[PDB]
Structures are given as C-alpha cells and as structure tokens.
Amino acid sequence: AAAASLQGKLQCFIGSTPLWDPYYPTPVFQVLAAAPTYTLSASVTPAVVPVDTATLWTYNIIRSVPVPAGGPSLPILCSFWDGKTGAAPTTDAGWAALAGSANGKGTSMAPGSTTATCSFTPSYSTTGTATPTLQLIQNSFALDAATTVGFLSPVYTAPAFATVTAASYTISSYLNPVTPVAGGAAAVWRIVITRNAAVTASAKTLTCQMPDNGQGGSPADVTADIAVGGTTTVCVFSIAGYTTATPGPYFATVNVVDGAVTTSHITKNFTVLASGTTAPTYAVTSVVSPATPVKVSTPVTYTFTITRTTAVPAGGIPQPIICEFFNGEGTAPASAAAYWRVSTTIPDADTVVAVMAPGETTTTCTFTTYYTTVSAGGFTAKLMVFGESATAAPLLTSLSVTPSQLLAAVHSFATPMVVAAAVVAVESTTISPNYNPTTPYTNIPTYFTFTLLRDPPVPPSASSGVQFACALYTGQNVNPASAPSAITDAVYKTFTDVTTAVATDANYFADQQLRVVTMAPGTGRVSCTFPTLYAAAGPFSPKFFVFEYASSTVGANALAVADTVTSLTSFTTQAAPTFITG
Numbered sequence: 001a002a003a004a005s006l007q008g009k010l011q012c013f014i015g016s017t018p019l020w021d022p023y024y025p026t027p028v029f030q031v032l033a034a035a036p037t038y039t040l041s042a043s044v045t046p047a048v049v050p051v052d053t054a055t056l057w058t059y060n061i062i063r064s065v066p067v068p069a070g071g072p073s074l075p076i077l078c079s080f081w082d083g084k085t086g087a088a089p090t091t092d093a094g095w096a097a098l099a100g101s102a103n104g105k106g107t108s109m110a111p112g113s114t115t116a117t118c119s120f121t122p123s124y125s126t127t128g129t130a131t132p133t134l135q136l137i138q139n140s141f142a143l144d145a146a147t148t149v150g151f152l153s154p155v156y157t158a159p160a161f162a163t164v165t166a167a168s169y170t171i172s173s174y175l176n177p178v179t180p181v182a183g184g185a186a187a188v189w190r191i192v193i194t195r196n197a198a199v200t201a202s203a204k205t206l207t208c209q210m211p212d213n214g215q216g217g218s219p220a221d222v223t224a225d226i227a228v229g230g231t232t233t234v235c236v237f238s239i240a241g242y243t244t245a246t247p248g249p250y251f252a253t254v255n256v257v258d259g260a261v262t263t264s265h266i267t268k269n270f271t272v273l274a275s276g277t278t279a280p281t282y283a284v285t286s287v288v289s290p291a292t293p294v295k296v297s298t299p300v301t302y303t304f305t306i307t308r309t310t311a312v313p314a315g316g317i318p319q320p321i322i323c324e325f326f327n328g329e330g331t332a333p334a335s336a337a338a339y340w341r342v343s344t345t346i347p348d349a350d351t352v353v354a355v356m357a358p359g360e361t362t363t364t365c366t367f368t369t370y371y372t373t374v375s376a377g378g379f380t381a382k383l384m385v386f387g388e389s390a391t392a393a394p395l396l397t398s399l400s401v402t403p404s405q406l407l408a409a410v411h412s413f414a415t416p417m418v419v420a421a422a423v424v425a426v427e428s429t430t431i432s433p434n435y436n437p438t439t440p441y442t443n444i445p446t447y448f449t450f451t452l453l454r455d456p457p458v459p460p461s462a463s464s465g466v467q468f469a470c471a472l473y474t475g476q477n478v479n480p481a482s483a484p485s486a487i488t489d490a491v492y493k494t495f496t497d498v499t500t501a502v503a504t505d506a507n508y509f510a511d512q513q514l515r516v517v518t519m520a521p522g523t524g525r526v527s528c529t530f531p532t533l534y535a536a537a538g539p540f541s542p543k544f545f546v547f548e549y550a551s552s553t554v555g556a557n558a559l560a561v562a563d564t565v566t567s568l569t570s571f572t573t574q575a576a577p578t579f580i581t582g
C-alpha cells in the first residue's frame with residue numbers, strides 16, 4: 001500500500017534484556033506509488049575560464065515528491081566529472097568510488113523541501129569545451145558502493161559547456177648594466193615572464209627568442225623553465241658586442257612561445273656607451289639614527305643613499321635595486337654573493353626593493369633593526385646591492401642564475417654601533433595580604449609580587465621574549481634551615497628553582513626561592529609572585545636579586561652592577577585578623 005507517514009519498530013536484545021522498552025521507534029519513511037524524478041539544472045562561473053584556474057559549477061536538484069516532514073533529511077551524494085579530465089565512471093560503483101574524494105560533494109535535502117545544491121570547483125588543464133556529467137547517490141551511513149543504484153538515469157549532462165582558454169603571458173624586462181659599454185662587460189637582459197595561472201601538471205618550458213637586440217643581431221634562442229605552482233620565470237640573454245654606430249636610443253624585441261601561444265614584447269629604451277669609456281660605478285653613503293651608543297632592543301634606523309656616477313637615461317629602463325643589509329650581530333655572510341639570502345617575501349627586515357628612476361642618480365634604502373646582544377666593541381653593519389626586479393628576486397636561486405652584483409665590494413658602515421645592555425629596575429614590591437603596604441601578617445600565606453621594568457621594551461616581532469631569574473631570601477631560616485652564606489651574587493644564584501612548585505610539596509613556602517619570568521615580545525615589564533609563610537613574628541630583612549636567564553642557565557646580575565641587592569624595608573609581622581568578608 002501507498003502511505004504518507006509510516007513508522008517501524010526495532011527491538012533488540014542483549015542476552016535477554018532489551019536495549020529499549022517497549023521498542024525503539026524508527027524515523028518516518030514515505031511510501032511512494034512510483035519512483036520519484038530528479039530534475040536538475042546547471043550553472044557556471046565564469047563561463048570562460050583560463051586554463052589551470054578554478055571554475056564554480058553549481059547544480060540545483062529538484063525532487064518531484066517532497067521529503068516527508070517528520071522524517072530525517074535525505075542525504076545526497078553528488079558525483080561529478082568535469083568532462084575534460086579522464087573519463088566518466090561507467091557504473092554506479094565508479095561514481096561512488098569517485099565521490100569519496102573532492103570530486104564528490106555531500107548535501108542534504110531538508111525535510112519538507114524540494115530543492116538542493118551541489119557546488120564544485122574543478123580546474124581544467126587543457127583548452128576547449130568541457131561538458132560535465134553528474135550522478136546522485138544516497139549517503140546512508142552504510143552505503144555499499146557495489147549494490148547502490150543512483151536515482152538519476154541516464155547520467156545528467158550539463159547542456160552548458162565551459163570554455164577553457166589558453167594561458168597568457170605578461171613579459172617585463174631589464175638590463176644589467178643599464179648602460180652597457182661597447183666591447184666591455186657583456187650585457188645581460190633579464191626577462192620576467194608571468195603566467196596568468198599557476199602550472200599544475202609539471203614544470204613548463206617557455207622558449208624565449210630575441211630577433212633583434214636593437215643592433216640588428218639575433219642571439220641564440222634560450223629556454224626558460226617555470227616550476228610547479230609557480231607563475232613566474234626568468235629568461236637570461238647574455239649579449240656581448242653592442243655597438244654605438246647607430247644613434248643613441250635602442251630597443252629590443254623578444255618573443256616568448258609556449259607551444260602554440262606566442263607573445264611578443266619590446267623593451268622600452270636603452271643606450272650603449274662608447275667603447276673604451278669608463279663604466280659607471282655605484283657608491284653607497286650611510287647614516288644611522290640615533291647615534292653611538294644605543295641600548296639593547298632600541299630601534300636603530302640605517303639609511304643608505306646609493307649614488308651613481310652618471311644619471312640613468314631619461315627614456316630608458318629604470319634600474320631595480322635589491323638592498324640586503326646585515327646589522328652586524330652574528331655570523332656575517334661569507335662573501336658578497338652570500339648576501340643573496342633566501343627571503344620568504346621581498347619587503348622583509350633584511351631585503352628592501354627600490355628603483356633608480358630614469359633621469360635620476362641617487363636612491364634610498366631604509367632598514368630598521370633591533371640589537372639583541374651587548375657589544376662594547378661596536379657593530380659594523382654592512383649593505384650589499386644587486387640589480388634585480390622584485391618579481392624575479394625570489395626565484396632567481398631556483399633558476400640557478402647569478403644575481404647581478406651591482407657593487408664592487410660590500411659597503412661597511414664607518415662608525416661601529418656600540419650597544420649597551422638594557423636598564424631594568426624593580427618598580428614595586430607589593431605584598432598580598434598586608435596590614436600595611438610594608439609588613440604582612442603572620443602564620444598565613446603572603447605573596448610578594450615584584451615588578452621589573454625594562455627601559456627599552458622587548459620589541460614586537462622579536463624571536464623570543466627575555467628571561468629573568470628572580471631570587472628571594474625572606475629570612476626566618478626555616479625551610480633552608482640556614483641563612484645564605486654571603487650576600488654575593490653567586491650564593492643567591494645557587495638558589496633552588498620553584499617556578500613549577502605547587503602547594504602540596506614542601507618547597508612552596510621556602511625562605512630561599514628562585515623563579516623564572518619571561519618578558520614577552522611587545523611588553524615593557526613583568527611580574528614575579530613569590531609565596532612565603534612567616535611562622536614566627538620578628539624583625540626580617542628580605543633580600544632580592546635579579547639575573548639574566550638564557551638556555552636554562554642563570555647569568556649575571558640584571559641590575560648592571562655586580563652584587564646588587566634590592567633590600568626590602570625591614571618589618572615585624574603582626575597578628576592576622578579573623579573577619580570574613582561577605
């Protein structure tokens with residue numbers, strides 16, 4: 001019989017006891033006099049998509065008979081074939097197997113509804129038309145790929161093909177040196193080729209040729225490679241033999257081919273200097289702010305002015321500038337070429353991209369650095385300059401092309417930067433609880449919070465925060481059972497570590513304690529809380545010490561003077577009150 005709402009009854013027994021009493025009702029299921037039909041519509045975005053780019057396919061599914069109101073939402077498994085890669089599965093088992101991966105989506109028809117949506121984002125790899133095929137399965141918790149039957153027969157084919165167009169190429173170029181000298185150093189044309197979409201199958205081999213270098217010559221054809229997932233490649237043309245017989249301005253044509261696709265480009269302008277003339281030479285001047293000396297973590301700004309002997313031609317190609325700056329702290333780069341450090345992104349704290357504009361002589365590279373260690377000898381920061389574009393800079397190492405060494409030797413700052421240690425002081429020593437801000441009660445746990453402020457705050461974006469070991473000797477000679485041998489730095493340094501001590505163990509209330517506190521980056525001060533318990537009332541002289549901390553080892557005194565003691569005001573503990581707030 002055909003009915004609208006129907007309920008089953010499942011009753012199961014372990015041994016003799018039933019899991020549910022009197023039974024477990026099952027969700028409402030509708031009985032249909034005929035097989036429901038599944039109408040379907042498809043939409044594309046964009047209708048025309050470049051190769052190796054995502055395209056949104058949207059399928060709207062409409063069911064002839066609405067899902068029962070009281071029953072559960074109907075699970076639907078959209079197995080979709082983009083129509084361009086491989087072949088569509090021939091059996092429903094193939095669709096079920098394919099739907100496990102990203103090519104198969106899972107939606108749910110809500111109860112009392114007649115519509116559902118399935119969206120996919122395929123990325124085609126070949127040019128031409130693509131017509132997808134989609135099939136619907138049921139996503140029951142126990143879906144057998146073999147015996148399952150899709151509700152859709154025959155497999156729906158979207159009557160709206162997507163047009164996958166071929167890839168495009170944007171071609172830029174620059175020259176090193178920007179004004180080649182005839183018969184001298186060989187000129188190098190660096191050609192940056194950018195693809196409108198990243199390659200996915202494998203590395204692609206662009207073929208770059210230069211029919212004319214402005215002088216009428218034709219250098220040997222070059223092949224450049226673009227790696228998987230990359231959108232940029234560099235083609236290097238080493239031309240030697242430029243001549244000044246033709247009038248000053250010149251321009252070169254370069255065509256780059258990828259199979260059928262051909263893209264032509266013309267370099268803007270450039271001038272070849274007369275043979276025998278002295279090649280233009282670059283120099284660097286350096287300024288610092290503030291002046292020597294500076295403290296640790298103080299923002300130090302270096303400004304380097306790069307000056308060319310002669311101005312760049314007004315109509316020619318502007319010269320890219322890559323400034324790699326080493327602040328002087330740590331291991332210096334091995335040589336000038338070693339300064340081509342691998343940078344994740346171009347505008348980092350060590351690499352700066354500038355442009356010497358045509359008709360201009362000087363440019364400026366600005367760096368901001370923080371000095372961590374202390375060196376009274378002074379740090380001599382250095383700078384190295386290359387001529388490379390920002391786009392081609394990251395991938396020059398991958399393509400095994402030597403960056404253009406734009407300087408004869410590394411520029412070293414004239415005056416070494418003498419760096420002194422930061423100044424840290426104990427701002428306040430609060431007691432909780434306390435009869436007055438100077439003395440605590442007796443026979444109750446009292447906590448001393450010491451606040452330490454560093455005059456130059458730990459800079460944001462620092463690798464790690466600073467660490468301070470704070471040592472305290474309250475007195476009363478109970479838990480250590482003896483006074484410290486001497487007030488010297490070493491004796492208090494040798495104190496036990498209780499940074500992770502809890503109230504259970506006997507070290508929680510120790511007359512001699514040593515704790516570790518980390519000043520986080522972007523903070524100026526830290527606090528250390530020490531628990532104490534004054535069993536007996538009497539005069540007391542708590543002693544406090546601060547030390548630097550590194551690699552879980554206690555360093556020298558943090559107060560910049562050997563054997564510096566922060567002596568709390570002497571006090572006599574008085575009786576505690578018994579009133580309870582509430």
Ligand SMILES: *[C@@H]1O[C@H](CO)[C@@H](O[C@@H]2O[C@H](CO)[C@@H](O)[C@H](O)[C@H]2NC(C)=O)[C@H](O)[C@H]1NC(C)=O
Binds near residue numbers: 247250268270316
């Ligand atoms: C880049 O060089 C080209 C080639 O010389 C310049 O185009 C022509 O240059 C000749 C040089 O004798 C002039 O007589 C023509 O008048 C130029 N043509 C045009 C349309 O201006 C071109 O001017 C140079 N580019 C710049 C920006 O100066």
